[PDB]
Design a protein around this ligand. Structure first.
Ligand SMILES: NC(=O)c1ccsc1NC(=O)CSc1ncn[nH]1
Length: 215
């Protein structure tokens, strides 16, 4: 496994988005993961629809929260592996109200066949990531509201409440770090991203890592 991996440099990651006033971070985490996997299977990088999940996935709870694993399971078992484009099913829950599910004429932006879970182990997550691309992870983000930059080293690591995307890591730095894509616009953190220290389970980053599998 390489000393550093950044899938942004390989053009595998879409622009940072805005979940707005909605507990839909689980959908942005899952969708962001699928977007990258679709690109790495050899297809164009495409914005996909979080709204599809917030409105249509009954197993999760829309703006009230959900799990990336449930989302992946829902896509495959309830939606034929279909993930819509953001273009044809745009995000509309930025204000907290989720529209009802529609199922006519939307465009399939990607097809998945399943998903895998990763061990609760940072080195093993890094090994998978370096080979297979960005990983959906859950974090404790309660100490993230004031973040403006730098490598976070004393993150509150007590309870999972937030879904994000691991896009890379750097083991060569003075303080090794993960590179994490958030869904809080580009005004938050480092141009919408955050670096947390790697190897000390900052923000419980290793506890619930998984990824969609493309077909
Ligand atoms: N923002 C989120 O919804 C989110 C994102 C990551 S965790 C989490 N919390 C929940 O999904 C509530 S249901 C649950 N079941 C087991 N743990 N949590």
């Amino acid at each position: 496994a390489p000393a550093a991996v950044d899938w942004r440099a390989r053009g595998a990651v879409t622009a940072v988005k805005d979940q707005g006033q909605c507990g839909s971070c689980w959908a942005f985490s899952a969708i962001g993961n699928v977007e990258c996997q679709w690109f790495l299977a050899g297809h164009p990088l495409t914005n996909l629809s979080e709204q599809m999940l917030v409105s249509c996935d009954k197993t999760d709870s829309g703006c009230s929260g959900g799990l990336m694993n449930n989302a992946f399971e829902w896509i495959v078992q309830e939606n034929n592996g279909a993930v819509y484009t953001e273009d044809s099913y745009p995000y509309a829950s930025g204000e907290g109200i989720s529209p009802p599910c529609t199922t006519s004429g939307h465009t399939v932006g990607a097809t998945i066949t399943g998903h895998v879970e990763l061990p609760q182990d940072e080195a093993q997550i890094a090994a998978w990531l370096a080979v297979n691309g960005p990983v959906a992870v859950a974090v404790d983000a309660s100490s993230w509201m004031t973040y403006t930059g730098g490598v976070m080293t004393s993150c509150v690591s007590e309870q999972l409440d937030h879904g994000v995307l691991l896009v890379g890591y750097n083991d060569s730095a003075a303080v090794p770090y993960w590179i994490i894509k958030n869904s809080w616009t580009t005004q938050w953190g480092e141009e919408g991203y955050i670096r947390i220290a790697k190897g000390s389970n900052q923000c419980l980053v290793k506890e619930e890592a998984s990824s969609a599998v493309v077909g």
